[PDB]
Antibody, heavy 212, light 217 residues
């Protein structure tokens, strides 16, 4: 029941600084090396380096010597990645990964922290209800920045028949749609609500779907 | 001077013996490598460690149709009876220690597609703008495209049966079950929505086109 849990998505302007965290649980933090891996959108994995969690000594890959700093808070079982003087192409999901060294491999990974570096403003989504054996209802999650958003239906109680589609991007705003398919005999007599979260703006929106 | 070379993509027929190659730099031809698998919006996951003599150990969550083989600087990941669930990006990696300094390098990754699956025509679901959006003087038309295989589609929109390209944004496909889905949006002003007799979402899949329309009236 070992886990690595990272901090959430962030939007920063070029020139600013960000600190991403990776909290280990289920083992002694100071006994395994913690590695950092960059994945730019649509690109491969790039090893950034690692930090010795006992001594606090960081080792950087050459492409990450300069603006990058690895540090620790051992009492919190947490590793940190700081990036200074941010550039657009620092936009990426960053993963922490534990290395075991019978075998040598990356055995546990954090979920990723998605960093967007842009001059565009944080923008919460506008959420619109989409009404027309089964009926398909929807929610349009329009014009948010940065990624990502999460969508559930009836607070997660409605899971079967839910399809959430990939976002599109245009002029520094993302849009996506989510749908749920329910029996026609149950709507509108039984209420259906989409729940949208946009972590980077700390917003949550509920929208009831009612007939149009 | 560690380098790992991988082709960027590979395709295999369903149920065939698939083989992916990762090649070490010449001077590192004897090195042990690691294979990882990665899916959308998820971190990579360890598949196996593979030595120069072909011996290997496989990771958590990996079924035994996966095996490793080696020849010279080449390291192979094989998948017996390859299944659609095996579609992913496979990335090799290699570590070394140099004057007490650890160094690690990932290959570029190979995206694997499984061909020869049963074909499936897209289902279209269209939605008109909400009254809420219309009050903001805007209209987004939504075309949800689902239940299709293989994953390639093109999407066009028509207004009164004439092509409309301005304001169209179409998503990449994503995998649901074994099949795929995508979305397309047509961004209009509320006046444009109200002024046309019809708007049509037109989806081409495997060279065949299906259409579904919205009528403002």
């Amino acid at each position: 029941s070992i886990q690595l849990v990272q901090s959430g998505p962030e939007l920063k302007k070029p020139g600013e600084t960000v600190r991403i965290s990776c909290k280990a649980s289920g083992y002694s933090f100071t006994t395994y090396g913690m590695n950092w891996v960059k994945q730019a959108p649509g690109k491969g994995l790039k090893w950034m380096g690692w930090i010795n969690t006992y001594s606090g000594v960081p080792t950087y890959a050459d492409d990450f010597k300069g603006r990058f700093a690895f540090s620790l808070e051992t009492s919190a079982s947490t590793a940190y990645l700081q990036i200074n003087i941010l550039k657009n192409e620092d936009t990426a999901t960053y993963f922490c990964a534990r290395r075991r060294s019978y075998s040598n491999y990356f055995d546990y990974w954090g979920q990723g922290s998605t960093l967007t570096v842009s001059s565009a403003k944080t923008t919460p989504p506008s959420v619109y209800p989409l009404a027309p054996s089964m009926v398909t209802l929807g929610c349009l999650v329009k014009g948010y920045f940065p990624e990502p958003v999460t969508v559930t239906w009836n607070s997660g109680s409605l899971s079967s028949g839910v399809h959430t589609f990939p976002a599109v991007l245009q002029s520094d705003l993302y849009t996506l749609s989510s749908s749920v398919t329910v029996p026609s005999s149950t709507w509108p007599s039984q209420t259906v609500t989409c729940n949208v979260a946009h972590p980077a703006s700390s917003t949550k929106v509920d929208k009831k779907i009612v007939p149009r | 001077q560690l380098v790992l070379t991988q082709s960027s993509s590979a395709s295999f027929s369903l149920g065939a013996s698939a083989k992916l190659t990762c090649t070490l730099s010449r001077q590192h031809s004897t090195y042990t490598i690691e294979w990882y698998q990665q899916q959308p919006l998820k971190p990579p996951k360890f598949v196996m460690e593979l030595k120069k003599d072909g011996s290997h150990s496989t990771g958590d969550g990996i079924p035994d149709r996966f095996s490793g083989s080696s020849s010279g600087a080449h390291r192979y990941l094989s998948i017996s009876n390859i299944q659609p669930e095996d579609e992913a990006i496979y990335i090799c990696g290699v570590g070394d220690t140099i004057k007490e300094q650890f160094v690690y390098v990932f290959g570029g990754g190979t995206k694997v597609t499984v061909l020869g699956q049963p074909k499936s025509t897209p289902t279209l679901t269209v939605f008109p703008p909400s009254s809420e959006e219309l009050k903001e003087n805007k209209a987004t038309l939504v075309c949800l495209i689902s239940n299709f295989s293989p994953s390639g589609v093109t999407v066009a929109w028509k207004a009164n049966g004439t092509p409309i390209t301005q304001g169209v944004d179409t998503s990449n496909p994503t995998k649901e079950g074994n099949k795929f889905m995508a979305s397309s949006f047509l961004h209009l002003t509320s006046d444009q929505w109200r002024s046309h007799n019809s708007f049509t979402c037109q989806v081409t899949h495997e060279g065949d086109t299906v259409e579904k329309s919205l009528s403002p009236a």
